[PDB]
Design a protein around this nucleic acid. Structure first.
Lengths: 108, 305, 185, 293
RNA sequence: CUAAGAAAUUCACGGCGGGCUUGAUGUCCGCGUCUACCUGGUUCACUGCCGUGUAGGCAG
């Protein structure tokens, strides 16, 4: 819970004092996976700018949170012999789903 | 102690040259008694004309920079002072050490009175937000907004009016603008059970306080114990050590209409938990309740979990 | 006019109703330019002003001979299996107009217009024509192919105010009002 | 118990890309010097298939091989699930071999549904279907203009032979290879529209063409009885029966008439549905995909 | 109605002169990424036009 809260606090502190978020040299992956730490609306936005300028969901965020939870704890092929590891895995899945539901409303 | 009808959110509030020390044993964030007294003074200024009440606060601390320095390879800190004017001669005689701090706090106030009953919703928030900008919240001035991206978002959020899913959506919408902060809540029950845990030798509360907030390193007969949270010692109200007096009795009182007492601080426990990790925001309001029979004058937060 | 034909869009698993509506509207304009005249108008009985939708019916107004000629022309060839037709019947109604609403929703076309009309510069045309001149329309639209240029354009359509009586006037080659009024029912 | 944790099916009825060509009418027997439709960059960036002045009709040549063996999955985890799926499809093909499915696929090959914008407004669309097993024709097929339609399916005097050929191929007892071309009179210089990439039109070398998945989607329009209605016509096979053009996803998971809900009680709970829904599940096994978890 | 209320750290400055880091080296062995998919959101809520003004008919 402290790791998830620290991640949420870092994500809130990153996209508050950095208004630069648009097309630029070296900003390709900062539009799809950067749906969390994404800037405001641009100056030359198009009509359907809800997908190419700011998608209305953390689309790449959930897989990244799942991969971070898988890399932060080295789960093995015998990590569910009792409910101790499986309970932490269920808690990690529930925390990832809660963070996804929270980040989905970020673009609105 | 009454649950409020509305949570009037005071926005990002830069306050400069605050009181850092705030207690004889702490030096960090200012006392929450300053916040409850600030809300009571704001009530005495605006709420009598607005026909409302104001009780609680949400202390979130978006940023905090102290006026300290770490002097030349030491593990401690010292305080930055301010040069005072001279005496009748050029002595620079007395230098009393008090700290300062700049903090960006944002409070949320519990309203009780006729908020929506006889008054509008945005106008009361506009009036209280332009009223709280001409006073001081902890011992230092409340800096106004002169920078860019003009917010003025005094969200006068209603709580008891609406369906339950709309109410939870309102709570998670108000928590969106508490984004980098950290709410401070008392944990008196935690200090009590942590006192009962180490009562094997001598169950002093001032020893359970002074051996919990630290990092107690203890090896294997090679680690530090697991940090349960962001535990801080805070002043949790006063405690009298002299009986009550009459208004004009005690020499040099602040005013000769209210009685005087000689009191002494009480040190409670507190936590800086993220605003996402609370069910409702009205769970984390600081009220000050007093028991004038004995000497306890305690501010705390009920329903803190 | 006095005779109307209702051509209903059969719903298509391959195409939305706007697609078949635009295709039949283009074939209607081709049949009207192959026919000529200013006496044939169109109406949309399933208009929704709230959802900005043209519905699934196209009601053509002309004389009986124009409907009976347009039934036997190959402007419906290939589209007899996409549509369903009624009979040429007499109208039962207030009147309204069917107007095309253009817009200067692009500052760049007016900028090149001012450059071509007064020999000015790009920066002077940028000061004279700013980007706030773009016109927003809450009107339904059909998408057809262009002639001289080849980029697909949307025709916005506005059904005018309902008036109890009709005025004398001609129509364009799209069935839209150039003075004429069509009965609304 | 439960289904397989991972299970997948390769597709059958393999389509290629459809090379477009332009020519004159009554030149259909000599479509070996018809120049391919060239895309040119002319200015606003447009991509128009400028047919030549001496070339009015469009011929879309593609090929199609059916494979057969729709029962056996690609990679199934459970060893107790492959045999029961094979027994299910075996009892299906033994009670009634998929001849009505092959009739509906033959009707999909009758009208040029693989043409999407280049089918509307056409005077006459003649699909020419060859059948080549050794390197030459075996029994060609010419199709009419009123039998084209889009929803009128019937036992025609020669569509039964095409349907029994598709059934004999799909049965798993000797595959077939059909060179399906389609002539259609569209209009001189009228912009026939193939598929487009991310404007950029999709182009195989020295021509323009249509994607294989679009032709396959047009060719598997079998699904008729879905619970909403059946008035507008048949839709294309999909596990959730989804259709983007109409805009509303049919075959909702609140009802148990979806593919994932019909196969799951077909093999486990042995709840065999009606013949049309069995046709739907089997036609959803001729398109492949990644089922299971 | 707030450990409330109150507050000028100031003036000046040569871091600086030197220098051998060097010698040697086996990254090895082995592998099934698979199956499916309508871009026909508008690759600009468009484009040159009768008068510098909105009033339009030829692949529009």
């Amino acid at each position: 819970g402290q790791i998830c809260d620290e991640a949420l606090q870092y994500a809130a502190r990153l996209r508050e004092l950095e208004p630069g978020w648009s097309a630029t040299p070296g900003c390709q992956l900062h539009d799809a996976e950067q749906l969390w730490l994404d800037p405001l609306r641009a100056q030359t936005d198009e009509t359907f700018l809800q997908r190419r300028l700011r998608g209305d969901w953390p689309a790449e965020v959930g897989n990244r949170f799942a991969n971070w939870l898988n890399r932060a704890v080295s789960s093995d092929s015998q990590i569910l012999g009792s409910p101790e590891a499986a309970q932490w895995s269920q808690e990690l899945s529930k925390e990832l789903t809660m963070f996804k539901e929270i980040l989905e409303d970020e673009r609105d | 102690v009454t649950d409020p009808e509305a949570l009037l959110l005071l926005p990002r509030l830069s306050i400069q040259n605050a009181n850092a020390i705030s207690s004889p044993l702490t030096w960090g964030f200012p006392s929450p008694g300053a916040f409850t007294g600030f809300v009571h003074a704001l009530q005495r200024r605006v709420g009598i004309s607005l026909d409302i009440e104001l009780d609680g606060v949400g202390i979130v601390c978006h940023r905090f920079e102290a006026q300290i320095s770490q002097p030349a390879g030491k593990r401690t800190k010292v305080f930055n002072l301010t040069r005072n004017p001279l005496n009748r001669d050029g002595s620079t005689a007395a230098i009393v050490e008090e700290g300062r701090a700049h903090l960006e706090v944002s409070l949320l106030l519990g309203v009780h009175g006729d908020g929506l009953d006889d008054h509008p919703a945005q106008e009361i928030a506009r009036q209280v937000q332009e009223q709280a900008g001409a006073m001081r919240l902890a011992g230092g001035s409340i800096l106004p907004w002169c920078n860019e991206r003009f917010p003025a978002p005094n969200a006068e959020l209603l709580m008891l009016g609406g369906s339950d899913e709309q109410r939870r959506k309102n709570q998670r919408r108000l928590t969106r603008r508490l984004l980098p902060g950290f709410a401070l809540v008392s944990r008196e029950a935690l200090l009590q059970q942590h006192l009962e845990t180490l009562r094997t030798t001598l169950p002093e509360a001032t020893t359970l306080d002074a051996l919990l907030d630290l990092c107690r390193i203890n090896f294997e007969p090679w680690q530090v114990r697991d940090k349960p949270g962001w535990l801080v010692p805070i002043p949790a109200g006063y405690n009298a050590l002299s009986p009550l007096y009459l208004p004009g009795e005690v020499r040099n009182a602040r005013d000769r209409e209210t009685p005087l007492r000689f009191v002494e601080n009480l040190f409670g426990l507190g936590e800086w938990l993220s605003p996402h990790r609370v069910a409702a925001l009205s769970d984390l309001l600081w009220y000050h309740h007093a028991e004038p029979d004995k000497g306890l004058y305690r501010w705390s937060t009920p329903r803190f979990v | 006019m006095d005779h109307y034909l209702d051509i209903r869009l059969r719903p298509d698993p391959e195409f939305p109703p706007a697609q078949l509506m635009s295709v039949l509207f283009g074939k209607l304009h081709q049949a009207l330019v192959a026919q000529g005249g200013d006496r044939i108008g169109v109406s949309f009985p399933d208009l929704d002003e709230s959802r900005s939708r043209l519905g699934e019916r196209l009601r053509i107004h002309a004389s009986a001979d124009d409907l009976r000629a347009l039934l036997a022309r190959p402007w419906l060839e290939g589209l007899r299996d996409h549509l369903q037709f009624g009979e040429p019947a007499v109208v039962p109604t207030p009147y309204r107009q069917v107007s095309r609403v253009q817009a200067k929703s692009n500052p760049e076309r007016l900028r090149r217009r001012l450059m071509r009309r007064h020999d000015l510069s790009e920066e002077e045309a940028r000061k004279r024509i700013p980007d706030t001149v773009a016109r927003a329309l809450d009107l339904p639209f059909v998408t057809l192919r262009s002639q001289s240029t080849g980029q697909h354009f949307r025709l916005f359509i506005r059904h005018g105010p309902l008036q109890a009586t009709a005025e004398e006037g001609g129509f364009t080659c799209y069935g839209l009002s150039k003075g004429g009024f069509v009965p609304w029912f | 118990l439960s289904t397989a944790s991972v299970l997948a099916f390769e597709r059958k009825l393999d389509p290629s890309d459809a090379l477009m060509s332009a020519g004159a009418w009554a030149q259909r027997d000599a479509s070996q010097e018809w120049p391919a439709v060239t895309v040119r960059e002319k200015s606003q960036t447009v991509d128009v298939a400028n047919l030549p002045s001496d070339a009015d009709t469009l011929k879309v040549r593609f090929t199609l091989r059916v494979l057969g063996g729709a029962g056996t999955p690609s990679a199934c985890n459970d060893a107790a699930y492959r045999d029961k799926l094979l027994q299910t499809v075996a009892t299906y093909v033994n009670e009634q071999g998929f001849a009505e499915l092959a009739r509906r696929y033959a009707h999909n090959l009758a009208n040029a549904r693989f043409l999407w914008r280049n089918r509307v407004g056409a005077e006459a669309v003649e699909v020419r279907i060859n059948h080549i097993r050794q390197g030459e024709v075996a029994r060609t097929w010419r199709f009419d203009a009123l039998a084209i339609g889009l929803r009128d399916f019937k036992a025609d005097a020669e569509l039964d032979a095409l349907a029994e050929l598709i059934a004999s191929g799909l049965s798993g007892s000797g595959h077939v290879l059909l060179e399906v071309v389609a002539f259609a009179r569209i209009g001189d210089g009228q912009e026939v529209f193939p598929s487009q990439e991310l404007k950029t039109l999709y182009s195989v070398r020295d021509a323009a063409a249509i994607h294989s998945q679009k032709i396959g989607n047009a060719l598997r329009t079998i699904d008729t009885w879905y619970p909403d209605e059946d008035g507008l016509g048949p839709i294309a096979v999909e596990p959730y029966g989804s259709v983007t053009s109409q805009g509303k996803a049919y075959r909702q998971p609140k009802q148990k008439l979806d593919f994932y809900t019909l196969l799951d009680n077909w093999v486990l709970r042995d709840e065999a549905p009606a013949v049309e829904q069995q046709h739907y599940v089997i036609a959803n096994l001729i398109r492949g995909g990644v089922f299971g978890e």
